[PDB]
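Sterol 14-alpha demethylase
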Amino acid sequence: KTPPVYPVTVPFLGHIVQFGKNPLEFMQRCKRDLKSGVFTISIGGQRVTIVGDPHEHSRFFSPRNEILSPREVYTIMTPVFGEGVAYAAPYPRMREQLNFLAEELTIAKFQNFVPAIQHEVRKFMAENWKEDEGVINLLEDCGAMIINTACQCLFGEDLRKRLNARHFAQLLSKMESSLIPAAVFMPLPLPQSARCREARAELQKILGEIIVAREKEEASKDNNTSDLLGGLLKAVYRDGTRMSLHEVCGMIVAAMFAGQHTSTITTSWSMLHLMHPKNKKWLDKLHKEIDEFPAQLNYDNVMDEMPFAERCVRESIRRDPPLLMVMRMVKAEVKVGSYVVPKGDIIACSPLLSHHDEEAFPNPRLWDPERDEKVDGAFIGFGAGVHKCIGQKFALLQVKTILATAFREYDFQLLRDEVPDPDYHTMVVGPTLNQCLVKYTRKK
Ligand code: HEM
Ligand SMILES: O=C(N[C@@H](Cn1ccnc1)c1ccccc1)c1ccc(-c2ccc(Cl)cc2)cc1
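Structure:
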Protein backbone atom coordinates (compact mmCIF):
# COMPACT_ATOMS: atom_id res chain seq x y z
CA LYS A 1 0.00 0.00 0.00
CA THR A 2 2.91 2.31 0.81
CA PRO A 3 5.07 3.67 -2.01
CA PRO A 4 8.62 2.53 -2.79
CA VAL A 5 11.46 4.41 -1.08
CA TYR A 6 14.99 5.51 -1.97
CA PRO A 7 17.89 4.78 0.42
CA VAL A 8 19.98 7.64 1.83
CA THR A 9 23.61 7.54 2.97
CA VAL A 10 23.71 10.28 5.62
CA PRO A 11 20.85 10.61 8.08
CA PHE A 12 21.37 14.34 8.28
CA LEU A 13 20.80 15.26 4.64
CA GLY A 14 18.39 13.57 2.33
CA HIS A 15 19.24 13.91 -1.33
CA ILE A 16 19.74 17.67 -1.04
CA VAL A 17 23.06 17.78 -2.91
CA GLN A 18 21.64 15.54 -5.64
CA PHE A 19 18.93 18.15 -6.10
CA GLY A 20 21.48 20.92 -6.53
CA LYS A 21 23.07 18.75 -9.19
CA ASN A 22 20.76 18.78 -12.18
CA PRO A 23 17.62 17.09 -10.89
CA LEU A 24 16.22 16.11 -14.25
CA GLU A 25 18.58 13.16 -14.50
CA PHE A 26 18.41 12.47 -10.78
CA MET A 27 14.63 12.02 -10.84
CA GLN A 28 14.75 10.01 -14.09
CA ARG A 29 17.39 7.67 -12.65
CA CYS A 30 15.07 6.74 -9.78
CA LYS A 31 12.06 6.07 -12.01
CA ARG A 32 14.00 3.60 -14.16
CA ASP A 33 15.35 1.72 -11.13
CA LEU A 34 12.26 1.35 -8.92
CA LYS A 35 10.21 1.01 -12.08
CA SER A 36 7.28 3.13 -10.87
CA GLY A 37 5.81 6.59 -11.40
CA VAL A 38 5.25 7.04 -7.67
CA PHE A 39 7.86 7.05 -4.90
CA THR A 40 8.97 8.94 -1.79
CA ILE A 41 12.28 10.75 -1.31
CA SER A 42 12.12 11.70 2.41
CA ILE A 43 14.41 14.74 1.95
CA GLY A 44 16.49 15.85 4.94
CA GLY A 45 14.73 13.33 7.18
CA GLN A 46 11.38 14.57 5.87
CA ARG A 47 9.51 12.21 3.54
CA VAL A 48 8.39 13.64 0.20
CA THR A 49 6.21 11.69 -2.24
CA ILE A 50 6.37 12.41 -5.96
CA VAL A 51 3.54 11.74 -8.40
CA GLY A 52 5.17 11.44 -11.83
CA ASP A 53 2.79 9.46 -14.04
CA PRO A 54 0.61 11.29 -16.59
CA HIS A 55 -2.28 8.91 -15.84
CA GLU A 56 -2.43 9.85 -12.14
CA HIS A 57 -2.55 13.66 -12.51
CA SER A 58 -6.27 13.82 -11.63
CA ARG A 59 -5.72 12.20 -8.23
CA PHE A 60 -3.73 15.32 -7.30
CA PHE A 61 -5.46 18.39 -8.79
CA SER A 62 -9.08 17.25 -8.29
CA PRO A 63 -9.11 17.08 -4.44
CA ARG A 64 -10.24 19.93 -2.17
CA ASN A 65 -8.41 22.32 0.19
CA GLU A 66 -9.53 20.68 3.44
CA ILE A 67 -7.90 17.40 2.41
CA LEU A 68 -4.91 19.02 0.69
CA SER A 69 -3.96 22.50 1.89
CA PRO A 70 -1.75 24.81 -0.12
CA ARG A 71 -1.36 27.33 2.62
CA GLU A 72 1.38 25.58 4.49
CA VAL A 73 3.87 24.82 1.72
CA TYR A 74 4.11 28.36 0.59
CA THR A 75 4.77 30.48 3.73
CA ILE A 76 7.56 33.02 2.69
CA MET A 77 5.57 35.06 0.25
CA THR A 78 3.18 35.44 3.14
CA PRO A 79 5.83 37.63 4.56
CA VAL A 80 6.16 39.46 1.25
CA PHE A 81 2.61 40.42 0.13
CA GLY A 82 1.04 41.67 3.33
CA GLU A 83 -0.23 40.39 6.68
CA GLY A 84 -3.28 38.11 6.64
CA VAL A 85 -3.32 37.70 2.87
CA ALA A 86 -3.98 34.69 0.73
CA TYR A 87 -2.72 31.66 2.56
CA ALA A 88 -2.72 34.43 5.06
CA ALA A 89 -6.44 34.24 5.47
CA PRO A 90 -9.34 31.89 6.09
CA TYR A 91 -10.19 29.88 2.97
CA PRO A 92 -13.75 31.27 2.90
CA ARG A 93 -12.21 34.76 2.89
CA MET A 94 -9.38 33.98 0.52
CA ARG A 95 -11.54 32.30 -2.02
CA GLU A 96 -13.57 35.44 -2.21
CA GLN A 97 -10.62 37.69 -3.10
CA LEU A 98 -9.38 35.52 -5.97
CA ASN A 99 -12.62 36.26 -7.79
CA PHE A 100 -12.39 40.06 -7.79
CA LEU A 101 -8.92 39.85 -9.28
CA ALA A 102 -10.00 37.31 -11.90
CA GLU A 103 -12.81 39.54 -13.18
CA GLU A 104 -10.31 42.27 -13.85
CA LEU A 105 -8.53 40.04 -16.23
CA THR A 106 -10.98 38.87 -18.82
CA ILE A 107 -11.60 38.90 -22.58
CA ALA A 108 -14.33 41.46 -21.90
CA LYS A 109 -11.66 44.07 -21.12
CA PHE A 110 -9.02 43.34 -23.77
CA GLN A 111 -10.71 45.71 -26.23
CA ASN A 112 -8.19 48.56 -25.92
CA PHE A 113 -5.04 46.71 -24.86
CA VAL A 114 -3.65 45.77 -28.29
CA PRO A 115 -2.81 49.19 -29.83
CA ALA A 116 -1.29 50.25 -26.48
CA ILE A 117 1.17 47.38 -26.57
CA GLN A 118 2.43 48.22 -30.07
CA HIS A 119 3.22 51.81 -29.05
CA GLU A 120 5.43 50.89 -26.09
CA VAL A 121 7.42 48.27 -27.99
CA ARG A 122 7.95 50.67 -30.90
CA LYS A 123 8.99 53.53 -28.62
CA PHE A 124 11.63 51.44 -26.84
CA MET A 125 12.74 49.70 -30.03
CA ALA A 126 13.43 52.86 -32.04
CA GLU A 127 15.64 54.40 -29.33
CA ASN A 128 17.46 51.40 -27.83
CA TRP A 129 18.56 49.88 -31.13
CA LYS A 130 19.53 52.54 -33.66
CA GLU A 131 22.52 51.32 -35.69
CA ASP A 132 22.11 49.18 -38.81
CA GLU A 133 24.17 46.46 -37.10
CA GLY A 134 24.37 45.99 -33.33
CA VAL A 135 25.02 43.62 -30.44
CA ILE A 136 22.38 43.29 -27.70
CA ASN A 137 21.52 40.86 -24.90
CA LEU A 138 18.09 39.37 -25.57
CA LEU A 139 17.30 38.19 -22.03
CA GLU A 140 17.95 41.67 -20.64
CA ASP A 141 15.94 43.34 -23.41
CA CYS A 142 12.80 41.22 -23.07
CA GLY A 143 12.60 42.16 -19.39
CA ALA A 144 12.38 45.89 -20.07
CA MET A 145 9.62 45.52 -22.67
CA ILE A 146 7.51 43.25 -20.47
CA ILE A 147 7.49 45.69 -17.56
CA ASN A 148 6.90 48.90 -19.53
CA THR A 149 4.13 47.20 -21.51
CA ALA A 150 1.87 45.98 -18.76
CA CYS A 151 1.57 49.40 -17.23
CA GLN A 152 0.35 50.82 -20.43
CA CYS A 153 -2.31 48.22 -20.01
CA LEU A 154 -3.39 48.48 -16.37
CA PHE A 155 -2.30 51.78 -14.80
CA GLY A 156 -4.17 55.09 -15.09
CA GLU A 157 -2.79 58.21 -16.76
CA ASP A 158 -2.54 59.89 -13.35
CA LEU A 159 -0.92 56.90 -11.63
CA ARG A 160 1.94 56.74 -14.13
CA LYS A 161 2.86 60.36 -13.34
CA ARG A 162 3.73 59.57 -9.72
CA LEU A 163 5.28 56.28 -10.71
CA ASN A 164 7.34 55.72 -13.83
CA ALA A 165 7.84 52.24 -15.31
CA ARG A 166 11.61 52.05 -14.80
CA HIS A 167 11.53 53.07 -11.12
CA PHE A 168 8.77 50.59 -10.26
CA ALA A 169 10.72 47.60 -11.57
CA GLN A 170 13.54 48.47 -9.16
CA LEU A 171 11.07 48.46 -6.26
CA LEU A 172 10.04 44.88 -7.06
CA SER A 173 13.64 43.72 -7.12
CA LYS A 174 14.31 44.51 -3.51
CA MET A 175 11.40 42.41 -2.41
CA GLU A 176 12.72 39.46 -4.40
CA SER A 177 16.14 39.41 -2.83
CA SER A 178 14.32 38.57 0.30
CA LEU A 179 13.94 35.16 -1.28
CA ILE A 180 15.90 32.56 0.59
CA PRO A 181 17.39 29.66 -1.28
CA ALA A 182 17.89 26.49 0.71
CA ALA A 183 15.50 27.75 3.35
CA VAL A 184 13.98 24.29 3.60
CA PHE A 185 11.08 23.63 5.86
CA MET A 186 11.52 24.35 8.45
CA PRO A 187 13.81 27.31 9.25
CA LEU A 188 11.14 35.33 10.34
CA PRO A 189 11.99 38.63 8.59
CA LEU A 190 15.77 39.14 8.16
CA PRO A 191 17.80 42.24 7.18
CA GLN A 192 16.95 41.49 3.54
CA SER A 193 13.39 41.41 4.86
CA ALA A 194 14.06 44.82 6.39
CA ARG A 195 14.43 46.23 2.88
CA CYS A 196 11.28 44.37 1.86
CA ARG A 197 9.56 46.07 4.79
CA GLU A 198 10.61 49.50 3.51
CA ALA A 199 9.72 48.93 -0.15
CA ARG A 200 6.02 48.28 0.52
CA ALA A 201 5.68 51.26 2.86
CA GLU A 202 6.98 53.56 0.12
CA LEU A 203 4.54 51.92 -2.27
CA GLN A 204 1.75 52.12 0.28
CA LYS A 205 2.29 55.85 0.87
CA ILE A 206 2.31 56.87 -2.79
CA LEU A 207 -1.06 55.16 -3.32
CA GLY A 208 -2.84 57.50 -0.89
CA GLU A 209 -1.86 60.66 -2.76
CA ILE A 210 -3.31 59.39 -6.06
CA ILE A 211 -6.62 58.65 -4.34
CA VAL A 212 -7.33 62.11 -2.91
CA ALA A 213 -6.89 63.90 -6.24
CA ARG A 214 -8.84 61.16 -8.01
CA GLU A 215 -11.88 61.33 -5.72
CA LYS A 216 -12.66 64.98 -6.38
CA GLU A 217 -12.37 64.10 -10.06
CA GLU A 218 -14.12 60.83 -9.31
CA ALA A 219 -16.53 63.33 -7.89
CA SER A 220 -17.94 65.44 -10.71
CA LYS A 221 -18.59 62.19 -12.57
CA ASP A 222 -15.15 61.89 -14.14
CA ASN A 223 -15.63 60.46 -17.61
CA ASN A 224 -12.65 58.12 -17.84
CA THR A 225 -12.49 55.97 -14.68
CA SER A 226 -11.83 52.39 -15.83
CA ASP A 227 -8.84 51.69 -13.56
CA LEU A 228 -8.55 48.14 -12.40
CA LEU A 229 -7.83 49.61 -9.06
CA GLY A 230 -10.93 51.65 -9.30
CA GLY A 231 -12.79 48.47 -10.04
CA LEU A 232 -11.06 47.13 -6.94
CA LEU A 233 -12.31 50.08 -4.87
CA LYS A 234 -15.95 49.24 -5.60
CA ALA A 235 -15.59 45.59 -4.57
CA VAL A 236 -17.78 44.69 -1.59
CA TYR A 237 -17.05 41.85 0.84
CA ARG A 238 -19.79 39.24 1.20
CA ASP A 239 -20.76 40.22 4.75
CA GLY A 240 -21.07 43.84 3.62
CA THR A 241 -17.73 45.62 3.99
CA ARG A 242 -15.36 47.45 1.61
CA MET A 243 -11.64 46.79 1.03
CA SER A 244 -8.91 48.44 3.10
CA LEU A 245 -5.86 50.20 1.63
CA HIS A 246 -3.66 47.44 3.05
CA GLU A 247 -5.35 44.70 1.03
CA VAL A 248 -5.68 46.62 -2.24
CA CYS A 249 -1.98 47.41 -2.04
CA GLY A 250 -1.33 43.68 -1.62
CA MET A 251 -3.44 42.53 -4.56
CA ILE A 252 -1.79 45.00 -6.94
CA VAL A 253 1.73 43.87 -6.05
CA ALA A 254 0.63 40.25 -6.51
CA ALA A 255 -0.49 40.93 -10.07
CA MET A 256 2.79 42.65 -10.95
CA PHE A 257 5.05 40.22 -9.09
CA ALA A 258 3.74 37.11 -10.87
CA GLY A 259 3.83 38.33 -14.48
CA GLN A 260 7.33 39.71 -15.12
CA HIS A 261 9.73 36.75 -14.73
CA THR A 262 7.59 34.02 -16.28
CA SER A 263 6.53 35.95 -19.38
CA THR A 264 10.06 37.22 -20.07
CA ILE A 265 11.58 33.74 -20.03
CA THR A 266 8.74 32.47 -22.24
CA THR A 267 9.43 35.25 -24.74
CA SER A 268 13.18 34.66 -24.69
CA TRP A 269 13.02 30.92 -25.40
CA SER A 270 10.61 31.55 -28.28
CA MET A 271 12.91 33.88 -30.19
CA LEU A 272 15.96 31.62 -29.85
CA HIS A 273 14.41 28.45 -31.27
CA LEU A 274 13.06 30.61 -34.07
CA MET A 275 16.32 32.21 -35.27
CA HIS A 276 18.33 29.05 -35.94
CA PRO A 277 19.38 27.66 -39.35
CA LYS A 278 17.68 24.40 -38.33
CA ASN A 279 14.31 25.85 -37.51
CA LYS A 280 14.07 27.54 -40.87
CA LYS A 281 11.22 25.46 -42.29
CA TRP A 282 8.89 26.96 -39.67
CA LEU A 283 10.22 30.52 -39.94
CA ASP A 284 8.58 30.97 -43.35
CA LYS A 285 5.31 29.54 -42.07
CA LEU A 286 5.24 32.50 -39.68
CA HIS A 287 5.67 35.13 -42.39
CA LYS A 288 2.87 33.32 -44.24
CA GLU A 289 0.66 34.51 -41.38
CA ILE A 290 1.88 38.04 -40.67
CA ASP A 291 2.17 39.57 -44.15
CA GLU A 292 -1.55 40.28 -44.56
CA PHE A 293 -2.25 42.62 -41.63
CA PRO A 294 -1.61 46.38 -41.80
CA ALA A 295 1.03 48.21 -39.75
CA GLN A 296 -1.61 48.66 -37.05
CA LEU A 297 -3.01 45.48 -35.49
CA ASN A 298 -6.45 45.27 -33.86
CA TYR A 299 -8.07 42.93 -31.33
CA ASP A 300 -9.56 40.65 -34.01
CA ASN A 301 -6.51 39.53 -36.01
CA VAL A 302 -4.57 38.57 -32.86
CA MET A 303 -7.32 36.62 -31.12
CA ASP A 304 -8.61 34.63 -34.08
CA GLU A 305 -6.40 35.14 -37.11
CA MET A 306 -3.16 33.98 -35.48
CA PRO A 307 -3.61 30.29 -34.77
CA PHE A 308 -0.10 28.90 -35.50
CA ALA A 309 1.82 31.55 -33.54
CA GLU A 310 -0.03 30.08 -30.56
CA ARG A 311 1.37 26.65 -31.40
CA CYS A 312 4.88 27.97 -30.97
CA VAL A 313 4.49 29.55 -27.58
CA ARG A 314 3.06 26.25 -26.32
CA GLU A 315 5.89 23.96 -27.41
CA SER A 316 8.40 26.31 -25.79
CA ILE A 317 6.74 26.11 -22.37
CA ARG A 318 6.28 22.35 -22.79
CA ARG A 319 9.97 21.63 -23.41
CA ASP A 320 11.48 24.01 -20.83
CA PRO A 321 8.93 24.80 -18.10
CA PRO A 322 9.66 27.95 -16.03
CA LEU A 323 8.37 26.40 -12.84
CA LEU A 324 10.08 23.34 -11.46
CA MET A 325 7.29 21.90 -9.35
CA VAL A 326 4.15 22.33 -7.24
CA MET A 327 3.59 20.99 -3.72
CA ARG A 328 0.98 20.50 -0.97
CA MET A 329 0.46 18.97 2.49
CA VAL A 330 -1.61 15.85 3.21
CA LYS A 331 -4.18 16.58 5.92
CA ALA A 332 -5.75 13.18 5.29
CA GLU A 333 -4.77 9.91 3.61
CA VAL A 334 -5.32 9.82 -0.16
CA LYS A 335 -5.44 6.98 -2.69
CA VAL A 336 -3.06 7.08 -5.64
CA GLY A 337 -3.00 4.51 -8.45
CA SER A 338 -2.36 1.23 -6.69
CA TYR A 339 -0.66 2.71 -3.59
CA VAL A 340 -1.66 5.03 -0.80
CA VAL A 341 -0.09 7.95 1.06
CA PRO A 342 -0.24 8.33 4.87
CA LYS A 343 -1.10 11.57 6.69
CA GLY A 344 1.40 14.35 7.47
CA ASP A 345 3.48 13.72 4.36
CA ILE A 346 4.48 16.03 1.51
CA ILE A 347 3.33 15.21 -2.02
CA ALA A 348 4.49 16.91 -5.21
CA CYS A 349 3.77 16.84 -8.93
CA SER A 350 6.44 17.82 -11.45
CA PRO A 351 5.81 19.48 -14.85
CA LEU A 352 9.50 19.00 -15.71
CA LEU A 353 9.37 15.22 -15.22
CA SER A 354 5.97 14.67 -16.88
CA HIS A 355 6.90 16.63 -20.02
CA HIS A 356 9.73 14.13 -20.55
CA ASP A 357 7.77 10.87 -20.37
CA GLU A 358 8.29 8.71 -23.48
CA GLU A 359 4.66 7.54 -23.67
CA ALA A 360 3.13 10.99 -24.13
CA PHE A 361 5.91 12.55 -26.18
CA PRO A 362 7.96 10.36 -28.47
CA ASN A 363 11.02 12.51 -28.22
CA PRO A 364 11.04 14.84 -25.19
CA ARG A 365 14.13 16.83 -26.16
CA LEU A 366 13.08 17.65 -29.74
CA TRP A 367 11.27 20.91 -30.60
CA ASP A 368 8.15 20.46 -32.75
CA PRO A 369 5.11 22.79 -32.69
CA GLU A 370 2.84 20.40 -34.63
CA ARG A 371 3.23 17.53 -32.15
CA ASP A 372 0.25 16.34 -30.11
CA GLU A 373 0.04 14.58 -26.74
CA LYS A 374 -0.63 10.84 -26.94
CA VAL A 375 -2.17 10.85 -23.46
CA ASP A 376 -4.94 13.30 -22.53
CA GLY A 377 -4.04 15.59 -19.62
CA ALA A 378 -0.32 15.25 -19.84
CA PHE A 379 0.77 18.87 -20.28
CA ILE A 380 -0.42 20.85 -17.29
CA GLY A 381 1.93 23.82 -17.95
CA PHE A 382 -0.65 26.30 -16.81
CA GLY A 383 -1.71 24.00 -14.02
CA ALA A 384 -4.96 22.13 -13.71
CA GLY A 385 -8.14 21.25 -11.92
CA VAL A 386 -9.24 23.43 -9.05
CA HIS A 387 -6.10 25.50 -9.01
CA LYS A 388 -5.71 26.86 -12.51
CA CYS A 389 -3.58 29.89 -13.43
CA ILE A 390 -5.49 33.11 -14.16
CA GLY A 391 -3.19 35.27 -16.29
CA GLN A 392 -3.14 32.64 -19.03
CA LYS A 393 -5.28 34.60 -21.52
CA PHE A 394 -3.50 37.87 -20.76
CA ALA A 395 0.08 36.57 -20.99
CA LEU A 396 -0.58 34.94 -24.37
CA LEU A 397 -2.14 37.98 -26.05
CA GLN A 398 0.84 40.06 -24.91
CA VAL A 399 3.50 37.53 -25.97
CA LYS A 400 1.92 37.06 -29.41
CA THR A 401 1.79 40.80 -30.13
CA ILE A 402 5.49 41.22 -29.39
CA LEU A 403 6.66 38.48 -31.75
CA ALA A 404 4.47 39.92 -34.50
CA THR A 405 5.86 43.43 -34.14
CA ALA A 406 9.52 42.41 -34.18
CA PHE A 407 10.01 40.02 -37.02
CA ARG A 408 8.29 42.43 -39.32
CA GLU A 409 11.12 44.96 -39.10
CA TYR A 410 14.25 43.18 -37.88
CA ASP A 411 16.17 39.99 -38.68
CA PHE A 412 18.20 38.33 -35.93
CA GLN A 413 21.20 35.98 -35.90
CA LEU A 414 22.66 33.83 -33.10
CA LEU A 415 26.45 33.92 -32.60
CA ARG A 416 26.75 30.80 -30.44
CA ASP A 417 26.97 27.24 -31.80
CA GLU A 418 23.66 25.91 -30.54
CA VAL A 419 20.77 26.89 -28.41
CA PRO A 420 21.71 27.88 -24.93
CA ASP A 421 21.45 25.51 -22.04
CA PRO A 422 19.09 25.77 -19.03
CA ASP A 423 20.28 27.16 -15.69
CA TYR A 424 18.85 25.43 -12.61
CA HIS A 425 20.50 27.82 -10.11
CA THR A 426 17.45 30.05 -9.47
CA MET A 427 13.98 29.03 -8.36
CA VAL A 428 12.23 30.18 -11.55
CA VAL A 429 14.29 28.51 -14.28
CA GLY A 430 15.19 30.12 -17.62
CA PRO A 431 18.04 29.96 -20.17
CA THR A 432 21.61 30.67 -19.05
CA LEU A 433 22.51 34.37 -19.31
CA ASN A 434 26.05 34.34 -20.77
CA GLN A 435 24.95 32.50 -23.92
CA CYS A 436 22.26 35.02 -24.90
CA LEU A 437 24.35 37.54 -26.88
CA VAL A 438 22.88 38.13 -30.35
CA LYS A 439 23.42 40.35 -33.41
CA TYR A 440 20.51 42.17 -35.06
CA THR A 441 19.99 43.47 -38.59
CA ARG A 442 17.35 45.55 -40.38
CA LYS A 443 15.24 45.09 -43.52
CA LYS A 444 14.39 47.85 -46.00
C1 HEM B 1 3.97 31.69 -18.42
C2 HEM B 1 3.11 32.37 -17.65
C3 HEM B 1 2.46 31.69 -16.43
C4 HEM B 1 2.68 30.44 -16.01
C5 HEM B 1 3.63 29.43 -16.68
C6 HEM B 1 1.87 30.21 -14.82
C7 HEM B 1 1.81 29.05 -14.09
C8 HEM B 1 0.95 28.80 -13.04
C9 HEM B 1 0.82 27.56 -12.30
C10 HEM B 1 1.63 26.26 -12.54
C11 HEM B 1 -0.11 27.72 -11.36
C12 HEM B 1 -0.58 26.66 -10.35
C13 HEM B 1 0.54 26.36 -9.36
C14 HEM B 1 -0.03 25.55 -8.22
O1 HEM B 1 -0.74 24.55 -8.49
O2 HEM B 1 0.25 25.90 -7.05
C15 HEM B 1 -0.63 29.07 -11.46
C16 HEM B 1 -1.61 29.64 -10.67
C17 HEM B 1 -1.78 30.99 -10.46
N1 HEM B 1 -1.22 31.99 -11.25
FE1 HEM B 1 -0.03 31.69 -12.90
N2 HEM B 1 1.17 31.37 -14.56
C18 HEM B 1 1.50 32.31 -15.52
C19 HEM B 1 1.01 33.59 -15.60
C20 HEM B 1 0.35 34.24 -14.59
C21 HEM B 1 -0.07 35.63 -14.57
C22 HEM B 1 0.13 36.65 -15.71
C23 HEM B 1 -0.68 35.87 -13.40
C24 HEM B 1 -1.29 37.21 -12.96
C25 HEM B 1 -1.25 38.28 -13.77
C26 HEM B 1 -0.66 34.64 -12.63
C27 HEM B 1 -1.17 34.46 -11.36
C28 HEM B 1 -1.56 33.27 -10.80
C29 HEM B 1 -2.40 33.13 -9.63
C30 HEM B 1 -3.02 34.26 -8.79
C31 HEM B 1 -2.55 31.62 -9.40
C32 HEM B 1 -3.36 30.98 -8.26
C33 HEM B 1 -3.53 29.47 -8.44
C34 HEM B 1 -4.78 29.08 -7.71
O3 HEM B 1 -5.89 29.48 -8.16
O4 HEM B 1 -4.67 28.38 -6.67
N3 HEM B 1 -0.02 33.68 -13.38
N4 HEM B 1 0.05 29.70 -12.49
O1 LIG C 1 4.16 33.79 -7.18
C1 LIG C 1 3.12 33.17 -7.36
N1 LIG C 1 3.03 32.05 -8.08
C2 LIG C 1 4.19 31.42 -8.74
C3 LIG C 1 4.53 32.16 -10.04
N2 LIG C 1 3.40 32.11 -10.98
C4 LIG C 1 3.28 32.89 -12.05
C5 LIG C 1 2.13 32.55 -12.64
N3 LIG C 1 1.57 31.57 -11.92
C6 LIG C 1 2.36 31.29 -10.89
C7 LIG C 1 5.39 31.44 -7.79
C8 LIG C 1 6.57 32.06 -8.16
C9 LIG C 1 7.66 32.07 -7.29
C10 LIG C 1 7.56 31.46 -6.04
C11 LIG C 1 6.37 30.83 -5.67
C12 LIG C 1 5.29 30.82 -6.54
C13 LIG C 1 1.80 33.64 -6.77
C14 LIG C 1 1.35 34.94 -6.99
C15 LIG C 1 0.14 35.35 -6.44
C16 LIG C 1 -0.63 34.47 -5.68
C17 LIG C 1 -1.85 34.86 -5.14
C18 LIG C 1 -2.53 34.02 -4.27
C19 LIG C 1 -3.76 34.40 -3.75
C20 LIG C 1 -4.31 35.63 -4.11
CL1 LIG C 1 -5.84 36.12 -3.46
C21 LIG C 1 -3.64 36.47 -4.99
C22 LIG C 1 -2.41 36.08 -5.51
C23 LIG C 1 -0.18 33.17 -5.48
C24 LIG C 1 1.03 32.76 -6.02
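DSSP finds 17 helices and twelve strands in the chain.
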